[PDB]
Amino acid sequence: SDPVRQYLHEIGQVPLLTLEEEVELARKVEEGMEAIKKLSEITGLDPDLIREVVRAKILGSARVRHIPGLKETLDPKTVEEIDQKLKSLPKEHKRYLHIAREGEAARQHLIEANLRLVVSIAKKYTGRGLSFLDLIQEGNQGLIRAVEKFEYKRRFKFSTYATWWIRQAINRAIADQARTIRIPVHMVETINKLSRTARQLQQELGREPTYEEIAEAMGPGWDAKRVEETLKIAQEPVSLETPIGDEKDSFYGDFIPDEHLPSPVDAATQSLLSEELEKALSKLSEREAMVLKLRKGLIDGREHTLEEVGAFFGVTRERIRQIENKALRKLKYHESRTRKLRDFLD
Amino acid sequence: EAALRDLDEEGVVRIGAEVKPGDILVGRTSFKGESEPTPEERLLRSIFGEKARDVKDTSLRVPPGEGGIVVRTVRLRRGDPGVELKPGVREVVRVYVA
Amino acid sequence: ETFPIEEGLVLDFLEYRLGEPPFPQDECREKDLTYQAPLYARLQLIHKDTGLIKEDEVFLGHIPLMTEDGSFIINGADRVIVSQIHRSPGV
Amino acid sequence: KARVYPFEDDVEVSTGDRVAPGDVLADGGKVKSDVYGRVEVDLVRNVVRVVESYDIDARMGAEAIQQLLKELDLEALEKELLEEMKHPSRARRAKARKRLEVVRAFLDSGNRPEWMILEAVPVLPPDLRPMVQVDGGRFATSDLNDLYRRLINRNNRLKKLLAQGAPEIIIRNEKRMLQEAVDALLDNGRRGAPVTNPGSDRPLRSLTDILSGKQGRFRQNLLGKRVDYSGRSVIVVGPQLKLHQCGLPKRMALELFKPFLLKKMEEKGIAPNVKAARRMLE
Amino acid sequence: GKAQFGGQRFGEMEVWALEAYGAAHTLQEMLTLKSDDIEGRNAAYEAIIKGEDVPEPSVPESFRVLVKELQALALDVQTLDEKDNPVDIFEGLASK
Amino acid sequence: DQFRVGLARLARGVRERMLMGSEDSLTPAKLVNSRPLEAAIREFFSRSQ
Amino acid sequence: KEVRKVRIALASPEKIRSWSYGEVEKPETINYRTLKPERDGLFDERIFGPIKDYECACGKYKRQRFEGKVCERCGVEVTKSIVRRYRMGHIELATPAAHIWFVKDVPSKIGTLLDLSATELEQVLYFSKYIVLDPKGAILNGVPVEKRQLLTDEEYRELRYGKQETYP
DNA sequence: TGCATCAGAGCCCAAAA
DNA sequence: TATAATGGGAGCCTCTGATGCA
Ligand SMILES: [Zn+2]
């Protein structure tokens, strides 16, 4: 009933490794990867493609899926085909298949046996914007990375290497997923630096620092303007569903007008303007109404240069400017006489 | 100029002025939305021969039913002694109407 | 109640002090400021293994001050903290 | 628990293969398996172990449930339940009835039971969960975006863990996390702890919350609405009124009828046209 | 609210009053031209400033919101005519 | 009461910092983060009922 | 035509995909610098429609009478912005997920069809217990495994992986 | 089979903020 | 990218109907 408690119980069913067991699994994993490289040489087949086939057979029929990197769609037909090329190897070659198979198995066990380590690291990162289980899963992701890169020859225990990768994975997740507006990981680093810096400055100064004081503390390149710009980018949005006083009766979003959809008055006004504009353009020639529409964008919305408008009507860049001026002149004359367009000037 | 009569050089309504609904308290301009020059407005502006301004009138006005005598104005910019505003805010003006 | 904070590192509480307000009451209302005092706490860090003692007065932030008439100024606005009736602890 | 099959020559299986009694193991068919099990190929001991175990298909989650839902012939289950409707026991007849009513519901309607399990999750149009810049240039956004974000993150992580062949513990934790994430989006708080934004106790508002309740879509915006051409003021007694009359303040009436007043201002010369009339009223 | 230049809330109980009076067109105005019917409210303003009578209303936008919110819940909501053929209240905009 | 809550939270950060840091160079200023405390009081005064 | 009836029915995964104008592949919302929507994110203009009327995202096709064009560069249809209230997206789950209404609304509809209690349906959906599709001749404690039987983790592993043991 | 136990369902309007 | 590190942490009313029990 409690998703954390459940996961913790499952984690506790895989016994921790002895130093011997730990070294053995790590050793088998390293040997298996070397075998996959070797099997690549023999066959002339993609090392990654081979690895997925080996891994497919260990995990079982349960998990079979397309892999983004594989050039061929990976389905039981192809893994049987490729597995049969592997089962066609001579005894001294076919043994590398057995090595690879046993490698994947040990990889699985090594990961499963270190899962409690991730939990003990992840529990320390709560409250930074990721849920506990989310932190556990990203931490687990780092543990997988760690198992593939671990070099057992160095005689260091596994926990030593994993912890680096697990910490790295959790910190990347927090930087990547914690914000509704996503921020580049490096920019988050600068923001966090500014926080630490400002908090230090407030601890010596007995008050919150100004923008200028932070710029000093940040070193060269930083002025007060830049501290302010950085804080602006770092602002997180607020919920439209934020309650507003009263009781449980109103939402913050209910007080926000909609500026996009026109109000009845605004919509009406813009429509009437288009129709009155067309009325005046029908009093011109077809060519001089099109010239104006093309120059001011009442077509595509962009204002064409004289060279482009001239090229569409076949005239000189000076000519299209001229027919525009008599168009505006005829237009200007009709306006002082008929007073149609006066009210739209606001 | 009738509309701006009671605003000082800086755009703030003068102390002692009587303000009625619709009157400008603080004049303010905002840069037009990036869509802004509608093609309809481009042709209209062209007819009267007035370039469409880059900024729009966002001035603070007296709401319906309110108004009175201006008894105070407070103006706070960024970069003046003693004042630091929330990030992004250049200046804040407060007008007290009695 | 909170101190001492144990593990061989142990942090113990000595005493706290409240400074004077950075701005007077009227000024806070003008500037949308909270009328408040800086709070500091004298703490001594002890290493139970080594015996090493580093002692310092750390700044804990500000605490809002009540005016003479029993109210507060919080972000420039005057506020009242209403007493709350409830069931007394006991058996 | 394994059978030991020593081999002199090459072995035809490999570690991880599953095997039934009689399958050829090594040495061109000479040695074969006596039991059901999982093949473990020992190159040191020069023996093929087969660990006794079955090819059983057993699953967890909505994937298992979806299969069982697909494997329903509703006509057949109707027959079974019809036979049950004759049983002497009062409780027995009742239980077959409740079941039979859901079955018949699906039968008449044309809905397949497996649709109660989601594969593609719909995404609401953005303007109904907006991200808007408020007055200060600050952003205000609907809770649904965070609920969707949780879902997408966990789904993508699930895709990655699957492609990299993580152990079942990792995949199971991830899958159960994925179900909970869909749950929060559709009806948050229904099962388990309500998902909240960080540093707030406020449950995020899910689709179910939007639809239902006093503040929900039906009662707030559908069976009732805020309206135009409306006003409010303090009431005062009007003894001089005839029964069909009320006193209406002129300033109220000018706003409520404003469009009508603009047109009438055009008939009379008070303004050149409707646009100028409105500008005069500002 | 007055500060937003708001309209008055015509709530559940107010609709009942209009229902008990049998004022179907008055009520329909409240539900459409005077609220969230976008085409309707736009058309009504233009008609009033032109001296024409207000036009027949269209679908209230908050019903469309309700439909899309039910689609987000994996429920298919279909408007039908008397022949049980689908009627499209989005006028082709949401269908490929 | 709100002060006490913020103080308990501040202690969590302190205890957590007394492990991951340097066992040699640590002051009380490096060990104590007051943000949890400031927030509890700021929360009470601004948003309490 | 006049609306005389409103039907409500379940939606297939196929139908949910037929509504959808695109898959939302990223938790991103809008870009922190440009404030424009992130491609493939929740606000993406390539999926739900243009933010501005008859204007594509990059602004190659900016005017009317181009209704229906989809800009090759930015991928956005030139149409009315009102469509961002209408067009649905979708997320393709890597594993099916139950719609909680059909799980937690008692008596459960899924549970009722399959003769599964509230506890049993919980245990399968939330990964507490296995359910058997094909026993393939399994036996546990002397009795054959029957289809639609619930197995614990310990029970499944003994069946699936065997009962090996290590003694220190 | 008839009784108990628990999970889930509701709990005034408008106004204001 | 390498000393070793391996299982979390918290809490404040009535009716109706299904579910689990002699
Ligand atoms: Zn484009």
> Which residue is listed with tokens 């005017």?
G63
Cα(D29)–Cα(G111) distance, integer angstroms:
49
Cα(A188)–Cα(A172) distance, integer angstroms:
10
Backbone Cα Rg of chain G: 25
Residues in A closer than 8 angstroms to G28, CB to CB, are 182
Task: Output DSSP code: residue D271.
Answer: S
Secondary structure, 3-state, D163-185? HCCCCHHHHHHHHHHHHHHHHHH
Deposited experimental method: X-ray
Given a contact cutoff of 8 angstroms between Cβ atoms, the answer to whether D24 and G60 are in contact is no
Given a contact cutoff of 8 angstroms between Cβ atoms, the answer to whether G106 and G119 are in contact is no
Tell whether E65 is within 8 A of chain G (Cβ).
yes
Residues in A closer than 8 angstroms to E54, CB to CB, are none
Q: Which of residues 123-152 of A touch F (CB under 8 A)?
A: 124
Using alpha carbons, select from E21, B16, B77, E13 the residue that is nearest to residue D214.
E13
Amino acid whose CA is nearest the C1' of H7:
G106
Token readout for A9 is 């119980």
CB-defined contacts A:D, below 8 A? 151
Given a contact cutoff of 8 angstroms between Cβ atoms, the answer to whether C58 and C77 are in contact is no
Tell whether A245 is within 8 A of chain C (Cβ).
no
Q: 3-state DSSP call for residue E61?
A: helix
Residues in D closer than 8 angstroms to A180, CB to CB, are 141, 145-146, 149
Q: Which of residues 40-79 of E touch D (CB under 8 A)?
A: 41, 45, 48-51, 60, 62-63, 65-66, 68-74
Cα(F41)–Cα(C37) distance, integer angstroms:
13
Using alpha carbons, select from A97, A94, A102 the residue that is nearest to residue A28.
A102
Beta strands in B1-98 (DSSP E): 18-19, 24-26, 29-31, 55-57, 60-61, 68-77, 91-97
Q: Which nucleotides of I are covered by protein (CB under 7 A)?
A: 1-9, 18-20
Cβ–Cβ below 8 Å for G10 and E74: yes
The phi-psi region of residue E41 (left if phi > 0; otherwise alpha if psi is between -120 and 50; otherwise beta) is alpha
- Smallest CA–CA distance, residue A13 to chain F, in Å, is 28
Using alpha carbons, select from C73, C85, C12 the residue that is nearest to residue C45.
C12
The letter for the amino acid at D158 is: L
Instruction: Strand I: list protein residues with Cβ under 7 Å.
Output: A 2, 4-5, 8-9, 11-13, 16-17, 22, 113-117, 119-120, 123, 126, 132, 149-151, 154-161, 163-164; G 106-108, 111-112, 117-119
Chain centre to alpha carbon of residue B98:
20
Cβ–Cβ below 8 Å for D69 and G113: yes
Tell whether C23 is within 8 A of chain A (Cβ).
no
Using alpha carbons, select from D201, A126, D237, A272 the residue that is nearest to residue E42.
A272
Given a contact cutoff of 8 angstroms between Cβ atoms, the answer to whether A32 and A99 are in contact is yes
Q: 3-state DSSP call for residue E83?
A: coil
Token readout for A91 is 């005894």
The phi-psi region of residue D229 (left if phi > 0; otherwise alpha if psi is between -120 and 50; otherwise beta) is left
The sign of the torsion formed by the CA atoms of A4, A9, A14, A18 equals positive
Q: Let me know how long chain E is.
A: 96
E38: Cβ contacts below 8 Å, ≥ 6 apart: A261, E58, E61
Intra-chain end-to-end CA distance of chain E, in Å: 41
CA-to-C1' distance for A116 and I19, Å?
38
Fold of B1-98: OB fold (Dihydrolipoamide Acetyltransferase, E2P) (2.40.50)
Q: List the single residue in D with minimal CA-CA distance to A249.
A: D215
Ligand 1 center to C76 CA (angstroms): 49
Token readout for D164 is 């990299």
CA-to-C1' distance for E13 and H16, Å?
20
Q: Are strands D139-141 and A238-239 parallel, antiparallel or unpaired?
A: parallel
Task: Give the full edge-to-edge strand order of the sheet including D131-133.
Answer: A238-239, D139-141, D131-133
Ligand 1 center to E38 CA (angstroms): 28
Ligand 1 center to G51 CA (angstroms): 12
Cα(A278)–Cα(A333) distance, integer angstroms:
16
Secondary structure, 3-state, chain G? CCCCEEEEEECCHHHHHHHCCCECCCCCCECCCCCCECCCCCCCHHHHCCCECCECCCCCCCCCCCCCCECCCCCCECCCHHHHHCCCEEEEEEEEEECCHHHHCCCCHHHHHHCCCHHHHHHHHCCCCEEEEECCCCEECCEECCCCCEECHHHHHHHHHCCCCCCC
Cα(D34)–Cα(D21) distance, integer angstroms:
4
> Which residue is listed with tokens 């009102």?
G82
Cα(G130)–Cα(D68) distance, integer angstroms:
13
The letter for the amino acid at G57 is: A
Backbone Cα Rg of chain C: 19
Other CB atoms within a 10 A radius of the CB of residue A4 amount to 14
Q: Which CATH class is domain A1-179?
A: mainly alpha
Query: Which chains have 3+ CB pairs within 8 A of D?
Result: A, B, E, G
Residue ranges of chain A assigned to CATH 1.10.10.10: 183-236, 262-343
Cα(D210)–Cα(D220) distance, integer angstroms:
10
The resolution, in angstroms to one decimal, equals 3.0
Ligand 1 center to B19 CA (angstroms): 48
CA-to-C1' distance for D247 and H14, Å?
21
CA atoms within 13 A on the CB side of C4: 13
Cα(C25)–Cα(C34) distance, integer angstroms:
9
Task: Output DSSP code: residue D15.
Answer: T
Cα(A86)–Cα(A38) distance, integer angstroms:
12
Cα(A40)–Cα(A55) distance, integer angstroms:
15
Token readout for D262 is 């603009």
Ligand 1 center to G35 CA (angstroms): 17
Residue C72: beta bridge partners? C79
Token readout for E95 is 């269908």
The reply to whether omega before G107 is within 30° of 0 (cis) is yes
CA-to-C1' distance for F6 and I9, Å?
18
Given a contact cutoff of 8 angstroms between Cβ atoms, the answer to whether D189 and G106 are in contact is no
Angle at which helices A76-86 and A19-43 pack, to 10 degrees? 90
> Would you say G58 is a known binding-site residue?
yes
Task: Output DSSP code: residue D126.
Answer: G
Token readout for A200 is 């230090």
Alpha helices in chain D (DSSP H): 62-70, 74-84, 90-109, 143-163, 168-186, 207-211, 217, 250-256, 258-267, 274-281
Given a contact cutoff of 8 angstroms between Cβ atoms, the answer to whether D16 and D39 are in contact is yes
Fold of A262-343: Arc Repressor Mutant, subunit A (1.10.10)
Cα(A151)–Cα(A29) distance, integer angstroms:
10
Domain residue limits, chain B? 1-98
Helix (H) or strand (E) holding A43: helix A19-43
Q: Are strands D57-59 and C72-74 parallel, antiparallel or unpaired?
A: unpaired
Chain centre to alpha carbon of residue A170:
16
CA angle B69, B60, D278 (to 5 degrees): 95
C29: Cβ contacts below 8 Å, ≥ 6 apart: C73, C76, C77, C78
G116: phi then psi, degrees, rounded to nearest 5: -125, 135
Cα(D85)–Cα(F20) distance, integer angstroms:
69
Q: Let me know how long chain B is.
A: 98
> Would you say G17 is a known binding-site residue?
no
> Which residue is listed with tokens 């044309």?
D110
Cα(G53)–Cα(G82) distance, integer angstroms:
8
Residue D214 class from Cβ within 10 Å (0-12 exposed, 13-18 middle, 19+ buried)?
exposed
Residue E26 class from Cβ within 10 Å (0-12 exposed, 13-18 middle, 19+ buried)?
exposed
Token readout for A88 is 């066609």
Given a contact cutoff of 8 angstroms between Cβ atoms, the answer to whether D37 and D2 are in contact is yes
- Smallest CA–CA distance, residue D186 to chain G, in Å, is 7
- Give me the numbers of helices (H) and strands (E) for chain B, helices first please: 1, 7
Q: What is the dihedral of CA A306, A308, A314, A315, to 10 degrees?
A: 10
Whether any strand H atom is under 7 angstroms from the Cβ of D88: the reply reads yes
- Smallest CA–CA distance, residue D278 to chain G, in Å, is 28
Amino acid whose CA is nearest the C1' of I18:
G107
Ligand 1 center to G40 CA (angstroms): 16
Token readout for G140 is 């546990």
Cα(E89)–Cα(B93) distance, integer angstroms:
48
Tell whether B82 is within 8 A of chain A (Cβ).
no
E77: phi then psi, degrees, rounded to nearest 5: -105, 120
Amino acid whose CA is nearest the C1' of I6:
A117
Q: Let me know how long chain G is.
A: 168
Cα(D232)–Cα(A10) distance, integer angstroms:
64
Backbone Cα Rg of chain B: 17
Token readout for E93 is 């905009």
Cα(A204)–Cα(A145) distance, integer angstroms:
42
Ligand 1 center to D129 CA (angstroms): 25
Ligand 1 center to A262 CA (angstroms): 24
Best residue in A228, A275, A292, A303 to probe B by mutation, most B CBs within 10 Å? A228
Query: Which chains have 3+ CB pairs within 8 A of E?
Result: A, D, G
- Smallest CA–CA distance, residue A238 to chain D, in Å, is 5
Amino acid whose CA is nearest the C1' of I7:
A8
Given a contact cutoff of 8 angstroms between Cβ atoms, the answer to whether G80 and G93 are in contact is no
> Which residue is listed with tokens 């290493």?
C47
Using alpha carbons, select from A122, A118, A144, A120 the residue that is nearest to residue A132.
A122
Token readout for A171 is 């910190």
Tell whether G119 is within 8 A of chain A (Cβ).
no
Using alpha carbons, select from E65, D139, G37, D205 the residue that is nearest to residue A256.
D139
CA angle G126, G128, G133 (to 5 degrees): 90
Residues in A closer than 8 angstroms to F29, CB to CB, are 203
Cα(C9)–Cα(A285) distance, integer angstroms:
92
Distance (Å) of CA F31 to CA A194, C60, D74, F34 = 19, 12, 67, 10
Q: Are strands D37-42 and G5-10 parallel, antiparallel or unpaired?
A: unpaired
Q: 3-state DSSP call for residue A185?
A: helix
Residues in D closer than 8 angstroms to G17, CB to CB, are 120
C34: Cβ contacts below 8 Å, ≥ 6 apart: C28, C62, C64, C73, C74, C75, F45
Amino acid whose CA is nearest the C1' of H12:
E13
Does domain A183-236 fall under CATH 1.10.10.10? My reply is yes
Q: List the single residue in F with minimal CA-CA distance to C14.
A: F28
Residue among B22, B88, B89 minimizing CB distance to D282: B22
- For the stretch A263-268, contacts whose Cβ atoms lie closer than 8 Å and that sit 24 or more positions apart, written own/partner, are A264/E41, A264/E42, A264/E44, A264/E45, A265/D278, A265/E45, A267/E42, A268/E42, A268/E45, A268/E46, A268/E49
Residue among E4, E38, E45 minimizing CB distance to A268: E45
Cβ–Cβ below 8 Å for A124 and F20: yes
Task: Output DSSP code: residue A154.
Answer: G
Residue among F16, F20, F29 minimizing CB distance to A203: F29
